[PDB]
Amino acid sequence: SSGLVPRGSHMWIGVISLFPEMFKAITEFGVTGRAVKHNLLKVECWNPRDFTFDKHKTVDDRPYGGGPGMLMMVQPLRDAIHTAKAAAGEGAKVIYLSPQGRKLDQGGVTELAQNQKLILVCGRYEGIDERLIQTEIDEEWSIGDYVLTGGELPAMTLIDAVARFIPGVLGDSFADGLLDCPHYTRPEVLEGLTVPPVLMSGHHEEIRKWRLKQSLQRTWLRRPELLEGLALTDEQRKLLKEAQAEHN
Amino acid sequence: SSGLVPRGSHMWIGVISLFPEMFKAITEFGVTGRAVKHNLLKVECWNPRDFTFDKHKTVDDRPYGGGPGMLMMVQPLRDAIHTAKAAAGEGAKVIYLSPQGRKLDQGGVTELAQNQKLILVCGRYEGIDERLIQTEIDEEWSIGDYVLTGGELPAMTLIDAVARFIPGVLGDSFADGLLDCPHYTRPEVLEGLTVPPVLMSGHHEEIRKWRLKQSLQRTWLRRPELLEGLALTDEQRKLLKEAQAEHN
Ligand SMILES: NCc1ccc(Cn2ccc3cc(C(N)=O)cnc32)cc1
Ligand SMILES: NCc1ccc(Cn2ccc3cc(C(N)=O)cnc32)cc1
């Protein structure tokens, strides 16, 4: 592999999925597409269908104890995992995406971004055998408290979020642990609604302060619990107090 | 439109995205692919690139007040939105995906699933003008407290999660508000690890109770805060107490 782009901190991400072609949504488009093309980011997929030996290529199996749903068939999933780890070498941490996992947040994205090598195991049906979690999975993660039709979109979300921490991928994110300020672009006036004059002012320091005050007001009004995790700066305590006083 | 599949509660979801081909990950594969093919689910995309008039088809614009990033250019995004609403008719609620939004959870998925018609607006760059949120967006939602390279994966996650609530899409999800029990499938013994005998027992009622006890133990050990939102049943208080006593 070759090219001119500093790829010092490049990431390799293996994927186990019955729907590998879904990952085209991240590998062929936009910033993540650029990361793949410039060898900042490598996503390599294995399909458990390819690790079957029966005529029909069965990748699901019946739960012990009855139930409504299927699970991922152990042998083809176990084999796909073992092939991904052999390709990867020492180091590669294996992640199972599931709703039973550690809740992903940006802090967790930056821990996950320290790994040079991830293997993301995508579950379909009602999930995978507990013994494979025990013996093959380093960490279980959720992207959030909702149920989806498989692990692919969780895995794609994880990939995109860690890719942003790869130096060179971007061309800030929960700046200061707060929600973002309002943004404006052209035109000056839109449906009789105008851009805050301060943003037209040219004064970078009065603009820094307006954005920070707005972030604090917006975190306060919508996600108060996010303030509780922060030791606010003296400036931040002052702008928050002010925004609260202009509310009342 | 035609076919034999009861589509009583069918959903129509408009999408505004500069990368419409990303939505192929949900419309051409698996359960969501089946929903689209059987007319349970319709995803229709508009690209703001198509609503440009300049030679180069500019879809980004400079923030007022300076900054590192671009925003979505207002005119082509505003026009794409207005075309999606005209196609949709009365009713269609417009959603902006962003980290500043209401946090998605399964409860929120079932509120969102009541709409027969959604329009999902996907932001790229540092986001969209505040005046369009004011005048075009009914609701702002986050899939979680992490920053991504655009709204597409959030929008795809939202679509997949609401699709599951469309009668006929599936072939339970935070059953009882708890994490899932362990599952097992073949083989009986795997790396010297065996399936809980109870799951082999045939006794449906002793199995119901083991799964529920395990859900409560697993919610307790990993997501205690999820218990606080619940009024547990008498049976649930009893199985939780027992699991806590077998821990200590
Ligand atoms: N038996 C219950 C059941 C669990 C999981 C699924 C699908 N699914 C797979 C991986 C994953 C992650 C998430 C998330 N929140 O990360 C959600 N759904 C997921 C379906 C049924
Ligand atoms: N200026 C800050 C900034 C905000 C948003 C993005 C990308 N992005 C668009 C929509 C969206 C939803 C989420 C989520 N959590 O739903 C995350 N990122 C998203 C990039 C920078």
From Swiss-Prot, chains A, B:
GO biological process: tRNA N1-guanine methylation
Compartment(s) of residence: Cytoplasm
Keywords: Cytoplasm, Methyltransferase, S-adenosyl-L-methionine, Transferase, tRNA processing
Residues the record lists as binding S-adenosyl-L-methionine: G123, I143, G144, D145, Y146, V147, L148
Functional note: Specifically methylates guanosine-37 in various tRNAs.
Family according to the record: Belongs to the RNA methyltransferase TrmD family.
The name this protein goes by in its record: tRNA (guanine-N(1)-)-methyltransferase
Species in which this protein is naturally found: Haemophilus influenzae (strain PittGG)
